[PDB]
Structure 1
Amino acid sequence: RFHSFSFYELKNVTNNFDERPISVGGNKMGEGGFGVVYKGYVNNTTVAVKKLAAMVDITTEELKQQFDQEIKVMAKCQHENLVELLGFSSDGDDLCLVYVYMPNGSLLDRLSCLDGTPPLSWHMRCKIAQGAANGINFLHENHHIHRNIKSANILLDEAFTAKISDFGLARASEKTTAYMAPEALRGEITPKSDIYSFGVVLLEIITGLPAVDEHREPQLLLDIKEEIEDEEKTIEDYIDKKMNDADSTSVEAMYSVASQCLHEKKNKRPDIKKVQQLLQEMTAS
Structure 2
Amino acid sequence: RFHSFSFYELKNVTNNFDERPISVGGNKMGEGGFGVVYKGYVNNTTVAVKKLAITTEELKQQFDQEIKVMAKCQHENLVELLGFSSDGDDLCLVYVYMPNGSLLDRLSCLDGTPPLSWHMRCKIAQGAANGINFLHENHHIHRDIKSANILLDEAFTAKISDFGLARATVMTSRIVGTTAYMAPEALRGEITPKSDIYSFGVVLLEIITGLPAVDEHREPQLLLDIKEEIEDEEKTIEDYIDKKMNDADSTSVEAMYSVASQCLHEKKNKRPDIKKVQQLLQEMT
CA 1:64–1:268 in structure 2 vs 1: closer, same or farther (change >3 Å)? closer
The offset of 1:212, in angstroms, is 1.2
Task: Say if 1:206 and 1:239, in contact at 8 Å, map to a contact too.
Answer: yes
TM-align CA RMSD: 2.4
The offset of 1:50, in angstroms, is 1.2
The offset of 1:223, in angstroms, is 1.5
The offset of 1:229, in angstroms, is 1.4
The offset of 1:33, in angstroms, is 2.0
CA 1:67–1:109 in structure 2 vs 1: closer, same or farther (change >3 Å)? closer
Deviations 1:151-191 (A, max 9, x none): 1111110000001111234669xxx2110000010011111
Structure 1: gaps of 5 or more residues: 53-57
CA 1:101–1:60 in structure 2 vs 1: closer, same or farther (change >3 Å)? closer
CA 1:102–1:59 in structure 2 vs 1: closer, same or farther (change >3 Å)? closer
Please report the TM-score for the alignment, with normalisation by the length of structure 1.
Answer: 0.89
Q: Distance between the aligned counterparts of 2:182 and 2:58, measured in 1?
A: 29
Deviations 1:95-127 (A, max 9, x none): 210011111111111111112211111100000
The offset of 1:36, in angstroms, is 1.9
- Alignment of structure 1 residues 157-236 onto 2, 5 Å: 157-169=153-165, 176-236=178-238
Task: Say if 1:7 and 1:93, in contact at 8 Å, map to a contact too.
Answer: no
SS of the equivalent of 1:169 reads coil
Structure 2: gaps of 5 or more residues: 169-177
Task: Say if 2:103 and 2:151, in contact at 8 Å, map to a contact too.
Answer: yes
Task: Say if 1:6 and 1:92, in contact at 8 Å, map to a contact too.
Answer: no
Task: Say if 2:140 and 2:167, in contact at 8 Å, map to a contact too.
Answer: no
Task: Say if 2:7 and 2:86, in contact at 8 Å, map to a contact too.
Answer: yes
The offset of 1:218, in angstroms, is 1.7
Match 2:126 to one of 111, 119, 130: 130
CA 1:25–1:230 in structure 2 vs 1: closer, same or farther (change >3 Å)? same
Task: Say if 1:74 and 1:168, in contact at 8 Å, map to a contact too.
Answer: no
Task: Say if 1:209 and 1:221, in contact at 8 Å, map to a contact too.
Answer: yes
The offset of 1:226, in angstroms, is 1.3
CA 1:38–1:171 in structure 2 vs 1: closer, same or farther (change >3 Å)? farther
Q: Distance between the aligned counterparts of 1:138 and 1:169, measured in 2?
A: 17
Q: Distance between the aligned counterparts of 1:237 and 1:67, measured in 2?
A: 42
Q: Distance between the aligned counterparts of 1:259 and 1:77, measured in 2?
A: 29
Q: Distance between the aligned counterparts of 1:107 and 1:63, measured in 2?
A: 25
Identity %: 100
Deviations 1:191-230 (A, max 9, x none): 1010000000000100111111223232111122211111
Task: Say if 2:22 and 2:28, in contact at 8 Å, map to a contact too.
Answer: yes
The offset of 1:59, in angstroms, is 12
Task: Say if 2:140 and 2:166, in contact at 8 Å, map to a contact too.
Answer: no
CA 1:233–1:148 in structure 2 vs 1: closer, same or farther (change >3 Å)? same
Please report the TM-score for the alignment, with normalisation by the length of structure 2.
Answer: 0.89
CA 1:69–1:222 in structure 2 vs 1: closer, same or farther (change >3 Å)? closer
How many residue pairs match? The answer is: 275
Q: Does 114-123 or 268-277 show the bigger shift?
A: 114-123
CA 1:204–1:38 in structure 2 vs 1: closer, same or farther (change >3 Å)? same
Task: Say if 2:66 and 2:166, in contact at 8 Å, map to a contact too.
Answer: no
